[PDB]
């Protein structure tokens, strides 16, 4: 868990299972950093603030 008033920049591959990947990713290994779906069609709550 993140501490209050702490900024984390290092984004490594996150192991989501027993399967050791070490840069393999795939199943049970998903990279934490993920982008928004910025659609103008998207309504209130999915538009930028």
């Amino acid at each position: 868990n993140l501490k209050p008033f702490e900024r984390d920049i290092s984004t490594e591959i996150y192991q989501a299972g027993n399967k050791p990947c070490n840069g393999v990713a795939g199943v049970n290994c998903y990279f934490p950093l993920q982008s928004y779906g910025f659609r103008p069609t998207y309504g209130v709550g999915h538009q930028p603030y």
Partner: protein
């Protein structure tokens, strides 16, 4: 006693996708009821469902 430790042992090959809940750490989770669904589907169609 829902033990998912064996889950990574028997059939970890193709996919371990978990939707709506944490893919791991559910072994310690306590909950009411569990439903099991079994079917044979094409490999490419696993993302469709």
């Amino acid at each position: 006693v829902a033990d998912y430790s064996v889950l990574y042992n028997f059939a970890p090959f193709f996919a371990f996708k978990c939707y709506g809940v944490s893919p791991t750490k559910l072994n310690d989770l306590c909950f009411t009821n569990v439903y099991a669904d079994s079917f044979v589907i094409r490999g490419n169609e696993v993302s469709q469902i």
